[PDB]
Amino acid sequence: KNHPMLMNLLK
Amino acid sequence: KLSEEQQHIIAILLDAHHKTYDPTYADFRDFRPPVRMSPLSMLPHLADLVSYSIQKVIGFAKMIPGFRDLTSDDQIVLLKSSAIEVIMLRSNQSFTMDDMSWDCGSQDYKYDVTDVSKAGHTLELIEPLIKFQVGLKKLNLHEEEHVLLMAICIVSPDRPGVQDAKLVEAIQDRLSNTLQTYIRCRHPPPGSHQLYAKMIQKLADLRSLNEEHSKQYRSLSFQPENSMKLTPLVLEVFGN
Numbered sequence: 001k002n003h004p005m006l007m008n009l010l011k
Numbered sequence: 012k013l014s015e016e017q018q019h020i021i022a023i024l025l026d027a028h029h030k031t032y033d034p035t036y037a038d039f040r041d042f043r044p045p046v047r048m049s050p051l052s053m054l055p056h057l058a059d060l061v062s063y064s065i066q067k068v069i070g071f072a073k074m075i076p077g078f079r080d081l082t083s084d085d086q087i088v089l090l091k092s093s094a095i096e097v098i099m100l101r102s103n104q105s106f107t108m109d110d111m112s113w114d115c116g117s118q119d120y121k122y123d124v125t126d127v128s129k130a131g132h133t134l135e136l137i138e139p140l141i142k143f144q145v146g147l148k149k150l151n152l153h154e155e156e157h158v159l160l161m162a163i164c165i166v167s168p169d170r171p172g173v174q175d176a177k178l179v180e181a182i183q184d185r186l187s188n189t190l191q192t193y194i195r196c197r198h199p200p201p202g203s204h205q206l207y208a209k210m211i212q213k214l215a216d217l218r219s220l221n222e223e224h225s226k227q228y229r230s231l232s233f234q235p236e237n238s239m240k241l242t243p244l245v246l247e248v249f250g251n
């Protein structure tokens with residue numbers, strides 16, 4: 001959604 | 012007494028910290044160079060510093076027992092609201108009360124209140140921040156208590172936007188009971204006197220520090236020229 005780099009770092 | 016699951020939790024958190032905190036500070040060479048003298052000259056270097064530790068904080072959080080049992084939305088909510096506070100906590104390791112500075116191995120990477128000022132922040136934040144760093148250092152926490160407090164900070168069920176507050180509280184309770192039991196059995200008096208209550212107080216101090224940083228960050232980041240020196244991750248986590 002809106003936090004793609006946070007989500008990607010959360011695997 | 013410390014159950015087998017509780018010493019397992021402590022072992023996991025100790026290891027997670029050692030894997031996400033680098034006391035060599037070797038990656039600081041990759042940041043934009045520090046500029047010390049009017050202009051917010053420390054903002055490029057400190058933006059990269061903050062962005063780096065947000066990554067480290069995320070890595071730590073992913074290893075907290077139970078954290079990944081949450082939805083991705085809740086993990087995002089918890090980290091967006093807590094990253095600033097965990098940075099304040101984890102920075103206490105490099106903080107020294109000899110000169111009230113964050114000493115990260117070299118003079119170039121030795122930060123004091125002047126460097127905070129040269130990133131746009133005012134004594135409204137710096138004064139309670141230094142008092143926090145001093146008071147946290149006073150607790151002389153065991154590393155076990157240090158990592159437990161960072162993890163409790165992250166998994167807080169009252170953060171705004173949390174969906175499964177039931178699960179977030181159940182995760183934090185196992186960490187809270189682990190920390191309380193650890194203080195009883197492994198922290199000898201008088202160092203353990205009121206230690207848990209003093210640690211929880213530091214969580215309250217962090218909420219106020221969070222509030223003040225967020226308001227100064229919102230004012231600073233409103234200026235597009237300042238936003239330009241931030242990183243994409245900082246803008247995503249701390250806000251537009």
Ligand SMILES: C=CC[Si](CC=C)(c1ccc(OC[C@@H](O)CCC(=O)O)c(C)c1)c1ccc(OCC(O)(CC)CC)c(C)c1
Pocket residue numbers: 031032033034036054057058060061063064067095098099101102105113122123126127130131140228231232245
């Ligand atoms: C000059 C002041 C030093 Si700081 C004091 C602490 C609060 C500090 C000190 C040591 C640190 O090292 C942490 C380990 O994690 C690294 C080891 C590892 O992980 O390997 C970190 C991360 C921070 C600081 C300065 C600026 C700032 O923001 C400015 C901003 O608002 C400008 C808009 C946002 C960009 C923040 C939030 C904090």
